[PDB]
Amino acid sequence: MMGPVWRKHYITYRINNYTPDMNREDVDYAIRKAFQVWSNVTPLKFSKINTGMADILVVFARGAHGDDHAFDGKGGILAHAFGPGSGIGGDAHFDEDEFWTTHSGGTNLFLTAVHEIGHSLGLGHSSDPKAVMFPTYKYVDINTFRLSADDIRGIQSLYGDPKEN
Ligand SMILES: [Ca+2]
Ligand SMILES: [Ca+2]
Ligand SMILES: [Ca+2]
Ligand SMILES: [Zn+2]
Ligand SMILES: [Zn+2]
């Protein structure tokens, strides 16, 4: 049996609040590129909103932060998201007790965002260590990063593929 999927292809997101670890512009870029990774291999279209309320709310929070799952300080769980649904549904939370970066020190925001957004869209983990949904964090360069076949197969078993033209 499968978890719930989004039942719409236009999905909005809003950045709740910004970590202080990085330039604001880099936060915006990383989340954006991360939605884009999944846009690239489905029909889904994501758009940022600054006011109102959105499907996927992106949050930086430490400790207990108001849902069913408290963060565990620095290290441990880096972040978590919730599968498609209303409300908390689809949201992504990043543990402020990490140090989020654009590089291979601390924890790389773009690559964790890709993994959390995977969950946002309905994916679970992968047993393939090449998949971005593998539950262990490893750095790879952003220019070079690609989804695995396994990641691709799982997202597209959910939303199908693109779609021209
Ligand atoms: Ca939501
Ligand atoms: Ca943690
Ligand atoms: Ca931090
Ligand atoms: Zn949370
Ligand atoms: Zn995960």
Question: Going from the N-terminus, what domains does the chain have, and what CATH number goes with each?
Answer: 1-165 (3.40.390.10)
The reply to whether 76 sits in an annotated binding site is no
Instruction: Give helix 109-121 / helix 24-39 axis angle, nearest 10°.
Output: 50
**Cα→Cα distances 35→10, 14, 71, 73, 113, Å:** 12, 12, 24, 26, 8
The reply to whether 105 sits in an annotated binding site is no
Q: Identify how the structure was determined.
A: X-ray
Neighbours of 14 (CB within 10 A): 18
- Cα gap 99→103, rounded to integer Å: 11
The reply to whether 154 sits in an annotated binding site is no
Whole-number Å distance, alpha carbon 69 to ligand 1 midpoint, is 15
Q: Which ligand is nearest to the CA of 94?
A: 4
Q: Which residues surround ligand 1, an ion (CB under 5 A)?
A: 89-91
Task: Provide the resolution (angstroms).
Answer: 2.2
User: What tokens appear for 151 in the block?
Assistant: 């990641």
